[PDB]
Design a protein around this motif. Structure first.
Motif, mmCIF file in Angstrom:
data_model
loop_
_atom_site.group_PDB
_atom_site.id
_atom_site.type_symbol
_atom_site.label_atom_id
_atom_site.label_comp_id
_atom_site.label_asym_id
_atom_site.label_seq_id
_atom_site.Cartn_x
_atom_site.Cartn_y
_atom_site.Cartn_z
ATOM 1 N N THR A 16 3.982 5.052 8.530
ATOM 2 C CA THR A 16 3.577 4.194 9.642
ATOM 3 C C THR A 16 2.173 3.622 9.419
ATOM 4 O O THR A 16 1.358 4.213 8.710
ATOM 5 N N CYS A 17 1.918 2.461 10.029
ATOM 6 C CA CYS A 17 0.621 1.799 9.941
ATOM 7 C C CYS A 17 -0.156 2.019 11.242
ATOM 8 O O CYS A 17 0.154 1.415 12.276
ATOM 9 N N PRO A 42 0.814 -1.228 0.000
ATOM 10 C CA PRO A 42 0.000 0.000 0.000
ATOM 11 C C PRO A 42 0.853 1.288 0.000
ATOM 12 O O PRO A 42 2.080 1.226 -0.133
ATOM 13 N N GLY A 43 0.185 2.436 0.149
ATOM 14 C CA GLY A 43 0.865 3.725 0.185
ATOM 15 C C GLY A 43 0.169 4.697 1.123
ATOM 16 O O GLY A 43 -0.589 4.273 1.999
ATOM 17 N N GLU A 44 0.413 6.004 0.934
ATOM 18 C CA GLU A 44 -0.203 7.050 1.768
ATOM 19 C C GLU A 44 -1.700 7.189 1.461
ATOM 20 O O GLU A 44 -2.090 7.379 0.305
ATOM 21 N N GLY A 45 -2.520 7.088 2.515
ATOM 22 C CA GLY A 45 -3.968 7.191 2.369
ATOM 23 C C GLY A 45 -4.636 5.854 2.071
ATOM 24 O O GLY A 45 -5.785 5.821 1.621
ATOM 25 N N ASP A 104 -3.728 -2.947 14.037
ATOM 26 C CA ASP A 104 -4.017 -4.003 15.015
ATOM 27 C C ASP A 104 -5.341 -4.720 14.674
ATOM 28 O O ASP A 104 -6.382 -4.417 15.273
ATOM 29 N N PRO A 105 -5.343 -5.672 13.687
ATOM 30 C CA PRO A 105 -4.161 -6.081 12.898
ATOM 31 C C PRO A 105 -3.870 -5.142 11.723
ATOM 32 O O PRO A 105 -2.709 -4.939 11.353
ATOM 33 N N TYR A 106 -4.939 -4.577 11.147
ATOM 34 C CA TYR A 106 -4.830 -3.673 9.998
ATOM 35 C C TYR A 106 -4.879 -2.202 10.432
ATOM 36 O O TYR A 106 -5.141 -1.891 11.603
ATOM 37 N N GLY A 107 -4.609 -1.305 9.477
ATOM 38 C CA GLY A 107 -4.635 0.122 9.749
ATOM 39 C C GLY A 107 -4.467 0.947 8.498
ATOM 40 O O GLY A 107 -4.705 0.460 7.393
ATOM 41 N N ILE A 108 -4.067 2.201 8.682
ATOM 42 C CA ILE A 108 -3.854 3.123 7.568
ATOM 43 C C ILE A 108 -2.430 3.678 7.622
ATOM 44 O O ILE A 108 -1.847 3.800 8.702
ATOM 45 N N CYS A 109 -1.887 4.020 6.449
ATOM 46 C CA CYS A 109 -0.529 4.561 6.348
ATOM 47 C C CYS A 109 -0.493 6.056 6.701
ATOM 48 O O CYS A 109 -0.902 6.911 5.908
ATOM 49 N N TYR A 110 -0.013 6.338 7.917
ATOM 50 C CA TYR A 110 0.092 7.702 8.435
ATOM 51 C C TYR A 110 1.497 7.975 8.975
ATOM 52 O O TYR A 110 2.290 7.048 9.154
#
Length: 33
Positions: free
Chosen positions: A20-21, A2-5, A25-31
């Motif tokens: 950063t993710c 993935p990437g930003e956003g 926990d387990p998944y998230g967003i790239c911030y």
């Protein structure tokens, strides 16, 4: 990867760019922390 956003995982699919993710926990967003 993935990437930003976009969503990311902290097990097999981490963030390709220097980001950063969150939550990840387990998944998230790239911030930026």
């Amino acid at each position: 990867c993935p990437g930003e956003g976009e969503q990311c995982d902290v097990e097999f699919n981490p963030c390709c760019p220097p980001l950063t993710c969150i939550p990840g926990d387990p998944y998230g967003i790239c911030y930026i922390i």
